[PDB]
Amino acid sequence: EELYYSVEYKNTATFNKLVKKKSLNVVYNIPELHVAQIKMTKMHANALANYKNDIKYINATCSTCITSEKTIDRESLFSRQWDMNKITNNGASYDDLPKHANTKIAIIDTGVMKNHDDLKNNFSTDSKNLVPLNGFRGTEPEETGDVHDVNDRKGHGTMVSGQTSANGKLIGVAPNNKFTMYRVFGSKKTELLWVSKAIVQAANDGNQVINISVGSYIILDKNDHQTFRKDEKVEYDALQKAINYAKKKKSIVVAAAGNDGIDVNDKQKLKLQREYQGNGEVKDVPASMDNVVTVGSTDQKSNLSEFSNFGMNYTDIAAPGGSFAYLNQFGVDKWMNEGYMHKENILTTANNGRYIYQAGTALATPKVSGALALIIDKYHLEKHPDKAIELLYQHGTSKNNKPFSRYGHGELDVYKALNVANQ
Numbered sequence: 215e216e217l218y219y220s221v222e223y224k225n226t227a228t229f230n231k232l233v234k235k236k237s238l239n240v241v242y243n244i245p246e247l248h249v250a251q252i253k254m255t256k257m258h259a260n261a262l263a264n265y266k267n268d269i270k271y272i273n274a275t276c277s278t279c280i281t282s283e284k285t286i287d288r289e290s291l292f293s294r295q296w297d298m299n300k301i302t303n304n305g306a307s308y309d310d311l312p313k314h315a316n317t318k319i320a321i322i323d324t325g326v327m328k329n330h331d332d333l334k335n336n337f338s339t340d341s342k343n344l345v346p347l348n349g350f351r352g353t354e355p356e357e358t359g360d361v362h363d364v365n366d367r368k369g370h371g372t373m374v375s376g377q378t379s380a381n382g383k384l385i386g387v388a389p390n391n392k393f394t395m396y397r398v399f400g401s402k403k404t405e406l407l408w409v410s411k412a413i414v415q416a417a418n419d420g421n422q423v424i425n426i427s428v429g430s431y432i433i434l435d436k437n438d439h440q441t442f443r444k445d446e447k448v449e450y451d452a453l454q455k456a457i458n459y460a461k462k463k464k465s466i467v468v469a470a471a472g473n474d475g476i477d478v479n480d481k482q483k484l485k486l487q488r489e490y491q492g493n494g495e496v497k498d499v500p501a502s503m504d505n506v507v508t509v510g511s512t513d514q515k516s517n518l519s520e521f522s523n524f525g526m527n528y529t530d531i532a533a534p535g536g537s538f539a540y541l542n543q544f545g546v547d548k549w550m551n552e553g554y555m556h557k558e559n560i561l562t563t564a565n566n567g568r569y570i571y572q573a574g575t576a577l578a579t580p581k582v583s584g585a586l587a588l589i590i591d592k593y594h595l596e597k598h599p600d601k602a603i604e605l606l607y608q609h610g611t612s613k614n615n616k617p618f619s620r621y622g623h624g625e626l627d628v629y630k631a632l633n634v635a636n637q
């Protein structure tokens with residue numbers, strides 16, 4: 215039987231010549247990162263590893279590494295956006311939006327309902343599909359591989375897009391900015407290599423803010439210097455390199471903290487997310503990677519959400535993503551018949567053309583991406599993205615002495631970020 219292997223090669227020309235020689239079935243490729251995915255028997259994988267001149271590393275593509283998203287519709291009544299009110303001084307910052315909304319926000323996710331009334335004006339036709347023909351491990355025969363197909367099957371990407379860009383009945387953080395969707399999910403799982411390719415594409419398409427509202431726990435064993443490996447180094451290195459490539463193109467990567475309420479500095483707890491007893495470590499990625507704005511989630515009381523991961527040398531900032539504390543406490547019947555979803559959940563755009571109440575770090579993250587786009591445009595920082603990040607942290611966070619280990623630089627404050635001239 216054949217398995218899917220992640221491969222990091224050394225040279226395009228020599229790798230291509232090797233592919234011809236052995237008739238390797240390459241199922242995905244990312245030339246900018248010298249990484250490809252090959253379907254082959256375990257024996258041919260071992261053999262392929264002996265070509266030290268053309269092959270750097272090889273590892274089986276991780277099956278159970280990506281964390282599952284949440285789109286379950288547990289709605290009809292349309293309430294107010296308490297979460298936006300918390301970061302805009304109760305709507306006062308909408309009067310301070312830049313006149314020229316030039317920055318484009320890329321969103322790497324499940325797709326988007328491009329004709330949603332609140333999202334259509336801001337949807338960019340640069341949007342692209344990174345899901346390959348036949349989808350995940352070739353088990354989705356309905357995935358044509360059509361580069362223009364970014365329709366949202368799962369519903370998550372539409373939720374995220376509303377937070378950055380709704381401009382109608384719902385209002386996102388950057389309602390005048392264009393957003394670009396890079397679809398990396400069909401109807402099943404995604405592959406971190408697709409996410410990596412999406413990052414490269416988003417950067418090449420000139421999106422100065424790149425939002426990744428999904429994450430995974432990956433196994434990395436730095437002590438192992440072998441070519442054929444048991445960890446997931448190819449995926450780890452590819453993702454980190456894509457992020458650094460984005461940085462090189464002057465794009466900012468914003469990622470969601472994991473949604474397991476874990477202190478990422480507690481090794482025992484991280485390893486438990488992959489039931490890993492090996493030598494290496496489990497890492498929350500891309501949240502913990504270099505050059506990533508790591509976003510945690512807060513609730514309606516400005517406290518860290520019970521599901522938000524956090525930690526020293528991890529969390530950079532926090533924004534409202536909601537909570538299920540009332541639900542988990544009282545049960546669905548009392549929670550629902552008594553309208554608690556209107557108090558602790560985030561109201562957002564849904565792929566049915568209407569709206570949905572949800573919660574998660576995936577809904578906090580786009581608020582920060584939107585804020586960065588506003589900062590870049592307000593202060594004309596296109597040529598100096600690091601200055602936009604610095605401004606976000608210094609002037610785009612409320613000062614309430616929240617511990618840095620849980621909230622990073624603080625809770626997002628868009629009104630403050632847009633009023634630096636005011637002093």
Ligand SMILES: [Ca+2]
Pocket residue numbers: 417420463464465
């Ligand atoms: Ca660029």
Ligand SMILES: [Ca+2]
Pocket residue numbers: 502503504527
């Ligand atoms: Ca780190």
Ligand SMILES: [Ca+2]
Pocket residue numbers: 501502503505506507508528529530
């Ligand atoms: Ca970070």
